[PDB]
Design a protein around this ligand. Structure first.
Ligand code: CA
Length: 223
């Protein structure tokens, strides 16, 4: 997260860290046994880390649970990043409390102008590299489809939306991939892609979760 603030320990209780020896992506806990992330975060051997703030220090509220199955969206296209969404089943149910909790799925899509919260452990600089150890947060609005398509001609599908600031300075960045975009208490987006981080006229692009609720629910109900 570039240009954000320190969330505060366990203030984003649905945020998870995907770990393969090191943090490599975020995700969101949608129930006691399932996490949703980006398909471009797929790899074998994932451990899901819940209840984290400092990812390099054991602080007492963590739960470390291995993944038992990963399901990449059937129509994911790695070249365009269309359908950039993945489900991860945990080997055992998480223990839900005030610091580890699930985030609701949306019943309706959020409209442009809605303010959302984006969070992650990604890079905090637009030029250079500095990775924080504690969770960072950014408040950002959903941008109009027109402004999003104008920023990225020929690249935005109906399964994507832009959020952030056209003037730059504030954005998600490398290492935030797969993490949540939460608006009015519902998961509306997944950190997907962009052109660099926090550059003028290049806002972040996010997977539009409201298009995938049926697939998510049917998949969880049969796996
Ligand atoms: Ca920790």
């Amino acid at each position: 997260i570039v240009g954000g603030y320190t969330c505060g320990a366990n203030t984003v209780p649905y945020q998870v860290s995907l770990n393969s020896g090191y943090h490599f992506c975020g995700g969101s806990l949608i129930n006691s046994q399932w996490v949703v992330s980006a398909a471009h975060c797929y790899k074998s051997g994932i451990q899901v880390r819940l209840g984290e703030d400092n990812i390099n220090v054991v602080e007492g509220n963590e739960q470390f649970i291995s993944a038992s199955k990963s399901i990449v969206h059937p129509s994911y296209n790695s070249n365009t990043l269309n359908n950039d969404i993945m489900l991860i089943k945990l080997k055992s149910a998480a223990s839900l409390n005030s610091r580890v909790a699930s985030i609701s799925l949306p019943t309706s899509c959020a409209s442009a102008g809605t303010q959302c919260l984006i969070s992650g452990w990604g890079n905090t600089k637009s030029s250079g590299t500095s990775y924080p150890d504690v969770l960072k947060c950014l408040k950002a609005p959903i941008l109009s489809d027109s402004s999003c398509k104008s920023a990225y001609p020929g690249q935005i599908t109906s399964n994507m939306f832009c959020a952030g600031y056209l003037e730059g300075g504030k954005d998600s960045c490398q290492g935030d991939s797969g993490g949540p975009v939460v608006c009015s208490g519902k998961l509306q987006g997944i950190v997907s892609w962009g052109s660099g981080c926090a550059q003028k006229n290049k806002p972040g692009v996010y997977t539009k979760v409201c298009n995938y609720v049926s697939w998510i629910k049917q998949t969880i109900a049969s796996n």
